[PDB]
Amino acid sequence: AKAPIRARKRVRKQVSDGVAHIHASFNNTIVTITDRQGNALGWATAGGSGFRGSRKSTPFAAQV
RNA sequence: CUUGAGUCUCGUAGAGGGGGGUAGAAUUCCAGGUGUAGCGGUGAAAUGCGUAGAGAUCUGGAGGAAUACCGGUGGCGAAGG
């Protein structure tokens, strides 16, 4: 038996479609993609994307 | 005496008052789903909120307060309003 592949041969969902809900808040920005029924599938933030209080409120921090 | 003053007829606009009712919108709160480690507050944060499952997103339920637009040096009330 040889060594295994570098990248996965299979993937557990393929839901194709969703809605990005943004709460661009006065001190931060929070972005969440949810399926069309509003059950959330995955998310990320300004402040969690490597910015503290002083930077997390900017469109450049939100862009990331 | 009718001219001041008063009165009815009649035309008429009004967020004027008191009593009651109502629709939708929203901030909040509760439950639960989905999801997953972030959230928050300031000049900076700190205090504070999270993984005992937050934030964000969906749906059910709950409360109490107030009427966005219209809106104008506009209209109405003795003034307070």
UniProtKB/Swiss-Prot annotation:
Subunit structure, interactors included: Part of the 30S ribosomal subunit. Interacts with proteins uS7 and bS18. Cross-links to IF-3. In stalled ribosomes contacts ribosome rescue factor SmrB.
Intrachain disulfide bonds: none
Signal peptide, first to last residue: none
Additional observations: Has been predicted to contact the N-terminal domain of IF-3 based on footprint studies; exactly how IF-3 interacts with the 30S subunit is controversial.
Functional description taken from the UniProt entry: Located on the platform of the 30S subunit, it bridges several disparate RNA helices of the 16S rRNA. Forms part of the Shine-Dalgarno cleft in the 70S ribosome.
Protein's name according to its UniProt entry: Small ribosomal subunit protein uS11
Record-stated family: Belongs to the universal ribosomal protein uS11 family.
Taxonomic source organism: Escherichia coli (strain K12)
Full-protein residues shown: 2 to 65 of 129
Modified residues (N-methylalanine): 1
